[PDB]
Design an enzyme around this catalytic site. Structure first.
Site, PDB file in Angstrom:
ATOM      1  N   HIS C  41       0.776  -1.246   0.000  1.00 26.30           N
ATOM      2  CA  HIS C  41       0.000   0.000   0.000  1.00 26.30           C
ATOM      3  C   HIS C  41       0.805   1.294   0.000  1.00 26.30           C
ATOM      4  CE1 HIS C  41       0.147   0.531   4.523  1.00 26.30           C
ATOM      5  NE2 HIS C  41       0.169   1.790   4.113  1.00 26.30           N
ATOM      6  N   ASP C  90      -0.843  -7.085   1.744  1.00 24.03           N
ATOM      7  CA  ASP C  90      -0.084  -5.851   1.893  1.00 24.03           C
ATOM      8  C   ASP C  90       1.406  -6.108   2.091  1.00 24.03           C
ATOM      9  OD1 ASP C  90       0.341  -3.178   1.963  1.00 24.03           O
ATOM     10  OD2 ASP C  90      -0.579  -2.806   3.936  1.00 24.03           O
ATOM     11  N   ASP C 186       0.913   1.540  19.853  1.00 26.61           N
ATOM     12  CA  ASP C 186       0.552   0.965  18.567  1.00 26.61           C
ATOM     13  C   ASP C 186       1.496   1.513  17.520  1.00 26.61           C
ATOM     14  OD1 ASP C 186      -0.836  -0.359  16.609  1.00 26.61           O
ATOM     15  OD2 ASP C 186      -2.670   0.785  16.864  1.00 26.61           O
ATOM     16  N   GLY C 190       2.971   6.156   8.459  1.00 25.19           N
ATOM     17  CA  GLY C 190       4.370   6.524   8.380  1.00 25.19           C
ATOM     18  C   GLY C 190       5.252   5.374   8.837  1.00 25.19           C
ATOM     19  N   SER C 192       4.240   2.267   8.213  1.00 25.96           N
ATOM     20  CA  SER C 192       3.908   1.252   7.198  1.00 25.96           C
ATOM     21  C   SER C 192       5.126   0.668   6.485  1.00 25.96           C
ATOM     22  CB  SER C 192       2.950   1.854   6.171  1.00 25.96           C
ATOM     23  OG  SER C 192       1.680   2.067   6.751  1.00 25.96           O
ATOM     24  N   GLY C 193       5.113  -0.645   6.267  1.00 23.42           N
ATOM     25  CA  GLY C 193       6.236  -1.278   5.594  1.00 23.42           C
ATOM     26  C   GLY C 193       7.341  -1.690   6.552  1.00 23.42           C
TER      27      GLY C 193
HETATM   28  C1  LIG Z   1       1.675   6.156   2.320  1.00 29.33           C
HETATM   29  C2  LIG Z   1       1.109   5.330   1.126  1.00 29.33           C
HETATM   30  C3  LIG Z   1      -0.303   5.730   0.635  1.00 29.33           C
HETATM   31  C4  LIG Z   1      -0.318   6.053  -0.875  1.00 29.33           C
HETATM   32  N1  LIG Z   1      -1.285   4.634   0.887  1.00 29.33           N
HETATM   33  C5  LIG Z   1      -2.433   4.704   1.631  1.00 29.33           C
HETATM   34  O1  LIG Z   1      -2.752   5.735   2.190  1.00 29.33           O
HETATM   35  C6  LIG Z   1      -3.312   3.531   1.784  1.00 29.33           C
HETATM   36  C7  LIG Z   1      -3.410   2.596   0.744  1.00 29.33           C
HETATM   37  C8  LIG Z   1      -4.221   1.437   0.859  1.00 29.33           C
HETATM   38  N2  LIG Z   1      -4.275   0.528  -0.199  1.00 29.33           N
HETATM   39  C9  LIG Z   1      -4.956   1.204   2.057  1.00 29.33           C
HETATM   40  C10 LIG Z   1      -4.875   2.143   3.130  1.00 29.33           C
HETATM   41  C11 LIG Z   1      -5.603   1.902   4.393  1.00 29.33           C
HETATM   42  C12 LIG Z   1      -6.958   1.890   4.376  1.00 29.33           C
HETATM   43  N3  LIG Z   1      -7.687   1.745   5.559  1.00 29.33           N
HETATM   44  C13 LIG Z   1      -7.122   1.626   6.738  1.00 29.33           C
HETATM   45  N4  LIG Z   1      -7.883   1.488   7.876  1.00 29.33           N
HETATM   46  C14 LIG Z   1      -9.331   1.225   7.892  1.00 29.33           C
HETATM   47  C15 LIG Z   1      -9.665   0.426   9.188  1.00 29.33           C
HETATM   48  C16 LIG Z   1     -10.076   2.579   7.829  1.00 29.33           C
HETATM   49  C17 LIG Z   1      -5.641   1.626   6.803  1.00 29.33           C
HETATM   50  O2  LIG Z   1      -5.125   1.489   7.920  1.00 29.33           O
HETATM   51  N5  LIG Z   1      -4.892   1.748   5.614  1.00 29.33           N
HETATM   52  C18 LIG Z   1      -3.426   1.629   5.760  1.00 29.33           C
HETATM   53  C19 LIG Z   1      -2.738   2.723   6.539  1.00 29.33           C
HETATM   54  O3  LIG Z   1      -3.246   3.820   6.670  1.00 29.33           O
HETATM   55  N6  LIG Z   1      -1.559   2.417   7.088  1.00 29.33           N
HETATM   56  C20 LIG Z   1      -0.933   3.258   8.165  1.00 29.33           C
HETATM   57  C21 LIG Z   1      -1.296   2.660   9.491  1.00 29.33           C
HETATM   58  C22 LIG Z   1      -0.475   1.564   9.918  1.00 29.33           C
HETATM   59  C23 LIG Z   1      -0.706   0.895  11.157  1.00 29.33           C
HETATM   60  C24 LIG Z   1      -1.775   1.309  11.996  1.00 29.33           C
HETATM   61  C25 LIG Z   1      -2.023   0.611  13.267  1.00 29.33           C
HETATM   62  N7  LIG Z   1      -1.353  -0.531  13.575  1.00 29.33           N
HETATM   63  N8  LIG Z   1      -2.889   1.075  14.126  1.00 29.33           N
HETATM   64  C26 LIG Z   1      -2.588   2.388  11.579  1.00 29.33           C
HETATM   65  C27 LIG Z   1      -2.341   3.056  10.340  1.00 29.33           C
HETATM   66  C28 LIG Z   1      -3.247   4.178  10.042  1.00 29.33           C
HETATM   67  O4  LIG Z   1      -2.705   5.263  10.080  1.00 29.33           O
HETATM   68  N9  LIG Z   1      -4.534   3.977   9.782  1.00 29.33           N
HETATM   69  C29 LIG Z   1      -5.513   4.956   9.543  1.00 29.33           C
HETATM   70  C30 LIG Z   1      -6.825   4.510   9.247  1.00 29.33           C
HETATM   71  C31 LIG Z   1      -7.835   5.458   9.009  1.00 29.33           C
HETATM   72  N10 LIG Z   1      -7.558   6.784   9.068  1.00 29.33           N
HETATM   73  C32 LIG Z   1      -6.323   7.251   9.348  1.00 29.33           C
HETATM   74  C33 LIG Z   1      -5.275   6.349   9.590  1.00 29.33           C
HETATM   75  C34 LIG Z   1      -4.048   3.304   2.986  1.00 29.33           C
END
Ligand SMILES: CC[C@@H](C)NC(=O)c1cc(N)cc(-c2cnc(NC(C)C)c(=O)n2CC(=O)NCc2ccc(C(=N)N)cc2C(=O)Nc2ccncc2)c1
Ligand SMILES: [Ca+2]
Ligand SMILES: [Ca+2]
Ligand SMILES: [Mg+2]
Lengths: 207, 142, 254
Positions: C41, C90, C186, C190, C192-193
């Site tokens: 992602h 992912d 948690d 940022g 991620s990966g």
């Molecule tokens: C930086 C790269 C960028 C282009 N990509 C994305 O934004 C992106 C691409 C995707 N295919 C999927 C996503 C994506 C969609 N939905 C999510 N949560 C649901 C439950 C609402 C979600 O957690 N993601 C991934 C993401 O944000 N990763 C960062 C991440 C990693 C780990 C945790 C954690 N262990 N608590 C929380 C988060 C996080 O920030 N999640 C969120 C979720 C909703 N709103 C803000 C932030 C996000």
């Protein structure tokens, strides 16, 4: 719904006396075997009774490592090989804290000696499953002051039966010259609310 | 055991119960108090479950109420000391004692292996680095 | 990383910082001198595939020292089953154009065999997650590498201990939960990966990738990580592959 074959174990119950602890569950497997895992709240999971068809698993050796810790176990159900239902199914057990929950075993009156007008009654210490390098620790070794023994004694011409209590494994009671008395002892952990007492020991009388 | 003539002898717990097995009444007649007789009856009439000598492999049985407890020798476990710890050397059991990889071999003993960058020691279970910076080690701490 | 601690310099030697056009993009994990495992992602919005850089030996983003090594990312391999915008599958396997040099500050995390990871590592309670991500949900990112100790949960438990939310992603067999549901610690945006590394009898292994969550350190929710054990085969086969001309490569999975 999830996968084809197998059912999750239920009614997980802890069977424990003097630290000999056995986890039991239902049901009797049909084309499925089990494996048990046990851990302290923050520790790693340890497997036991690998692919057993039994519906019980001895967890003594794991809990005697620290009887005061709180353990949780879980029972996994695996489809008998080929029956790979088209993570494994499992069920958690209630939490269990040995020191606070193990049943106190049945005591045994070791002996009783007459000393003039007084009588000494000695309780044999009870061996527990806890080990101390080659030997089995006694209930007193484990509980120390937390453990007391109670004694029930009566005459024959008596009308009620009296009780005595001790912080050791010996009672020194006052008796009536001549009369023959009968005794029965009980292990007790006063600081407990439930399961605070053992079953009574076999009755012994002076004849 | 009550057989005309023996009964002439005065009521004795020892003789009527410990040597001849008594019933509830015979025992109560001797104790007089019902709660006293119960107390005595709970154990006496419970039975010695250790009679079937259930503890195996040198174990020691200790009676309890409607049950028993088995004390096992170091190399055994199980409610009846039936489990041989020496027969549980399999990968699902604490990784078969292997430091890194474990391979089960039914019919024979399991073997241990190591990740690239490491090699198996003589003890057959430990792994040692073959390179300066093996994967998974932290140099400044090492 | 929310509620963690600063990872002392050199103690998280396999941590990777991915940049695109010079700006911080995501974390990653070095598994050998030329391959880095990250999250798929992280690449959904990349337009300049040739401006992808991997930095090893990094610690304080605010200052450069002689331990940092930068390498161009020659290839980004993601499973074909991965769907942009979603969370399943992912994972991303990255080929560096030239290998990095292993040093006291740059060492790969061991990618384990599948069986060992499923039957043994999966039961090690705690594992470490790290990154330069947000120090608070929607907060600012970290300048110094942060690291956190988090306990793993089997999915049945994760599902039973999580507050129900009408619309949320399924936790699949390709993921696993780890963390705390009390809002205190948690991993976050940022991070991620980055790695979810597990210690076992003297050696550290890669068991997960920081992937997603309902916000960060949200009461009633756990972090969700990509289950690396499900990709061991796919990763080893690909690491034996010959390079493509283009950077991105959507490889079949399984
Ligand atoms: C930086 C790269 C960028 C282009 N990509 C994305 O934004 C992106 C691409 C995707 N295919 C999927 C996503 C994506 C969609 N939905 C999510 N949560 C649901 C439950 C609402 C979600 O957690 N993601 C991934 C993401 O944000 N990763 C960062 C991440 C990693 C780990 C945790 C954690 N262990 N608590 C929380 C988060 C996080 O920030 N999640 C969120 C979720 C909703 N709103 C803000 C932030 C996000
Ligand atoms: Ca009995
Ligand atoms: Ca720096
Ligand atoms: Mg006699």
């Amino acid at each position: 719904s999830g996968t084809t074959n197998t059912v999750a174990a239920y009614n997980l119950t802890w069977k424990s006396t003097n630290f000999k602890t056995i986890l039991e569950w239902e049901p009797k497997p049909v084309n499925q075997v089990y494996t048990v895992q046990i851990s302290t709240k923050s520790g790693d999971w340890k497997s036991k009774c690998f692919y057993t068809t039994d519906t019980e698993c001895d967890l003594t050796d794991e809990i005697v490592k620290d009887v005061k810790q709180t353990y949780l176990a879980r029972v996994f159900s695996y489809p008998a090989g080929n029956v790979e239902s088209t993570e494994p199914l499992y069920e958690n057990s209630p939490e269990f804290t040995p020191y606070l929950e193990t049943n106190l075993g049945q005591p045994t009156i070791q002996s009783f000696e007459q000393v003039g007008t007084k009588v000494n009654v000695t309780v044999e210490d009870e061996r527990t499953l806890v080990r101390r390098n080659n030997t089995f620790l006694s209930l007193r070794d484990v509980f120390g002051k937390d453990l007391i023994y109670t004694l029930y004694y009566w005459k024959s011409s008596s009308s009620g039966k009296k009780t005595a209590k001790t912080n050791t494994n010996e009672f020194l009671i006052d008796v009536d010259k001549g009369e023959n008395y009968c005794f029965s002892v009980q292990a007790v952990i006063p600081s407990r609310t439930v399961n605070r007492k053992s079953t009574d020991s076999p009755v012994e009388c002076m004849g | 055991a009550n057989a005309f003539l023996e009964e002439l002898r005065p009521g004795s717990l020892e003789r009527e119960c410990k040597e001849e097995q008594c019933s509830f009444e015979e025992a109560r007649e001797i104790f007089k108090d019902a709660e006293r007789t119960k107390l005595f009856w709970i154990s006496y009439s419970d039975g010695d479950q250790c009679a079937s000598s259930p503890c195996q492999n040198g174990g020691s049985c200790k009676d309890q109420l409607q049950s028993y407890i088995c004390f096992c020798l170091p190399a055994f476990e199980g409610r009846n000391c039936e489990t041989h710890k020496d027969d549980q050397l399999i990968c699902v059991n604490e990784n078969g004692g292997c430091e890194q990889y474990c391979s089960d071999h039914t019919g024979t003993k399991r073997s241990c292996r190591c990740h690239e960058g490491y090699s198996l020691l003589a003890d057959g279970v430990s792994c040692t680095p073959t390179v300066e910076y093996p994967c998974g080690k932290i140099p400044i701490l090492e | 990383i929310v509620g963690g601690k600063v990872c002392p310099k050199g103690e998280c030697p396999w941590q990777v910082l991915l940049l695109v056009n010079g700006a911080q993009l995501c974390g990653g994990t070095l598994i050998n001198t030329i391959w880095v495992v990250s999250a798929a992602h992280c690449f959904d919005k990349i337009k300049n595939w040739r401006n992808l850089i991997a930095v090893l030996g990094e610690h304080d983003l605010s200052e450069h020292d002689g331990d940092e090594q930068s390498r161009r990312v020659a290839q980004v391999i993601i499973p074909s089953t991965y769907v942009p915008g979603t969370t399943n599958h992912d994972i991303a396997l990255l080929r560096l154009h030239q290998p990095v040099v292993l040093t006291d500050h740059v060492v790969p995390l061991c990618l384990p065999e599948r069986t060992f990871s499923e039957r043994t590592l999966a039961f090690v309670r705690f594992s470490l997650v790290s990154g330069w991500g947000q120090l608070l949900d929607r907060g600012a990112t970290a300048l110094e590498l942060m690291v956190l100790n988090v306990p793993r949960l089997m999915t049945q438990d994760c599902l039973q201990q999580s507050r129900k939310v009408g619309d949320s992603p399924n936790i699949t067999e390709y993921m696993f939960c780890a963390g705390y549901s009390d809002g205190s610690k948690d991993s976050c945006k940022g991070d991620s990966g980055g790695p979810h590394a597990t210690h076992y009898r003297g050696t550290w292994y890669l068991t997960g990738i920081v992937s997603w969550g309902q916000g960060c350190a949200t009461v009633g929710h756990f972090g969700v990580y990509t289950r690396v054990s499900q990709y061991i085969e796919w990763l080893q086969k690909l690491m034996r592959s010959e390079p493509r001309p283009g950077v991105l490569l959507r490889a079949p999975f399984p």
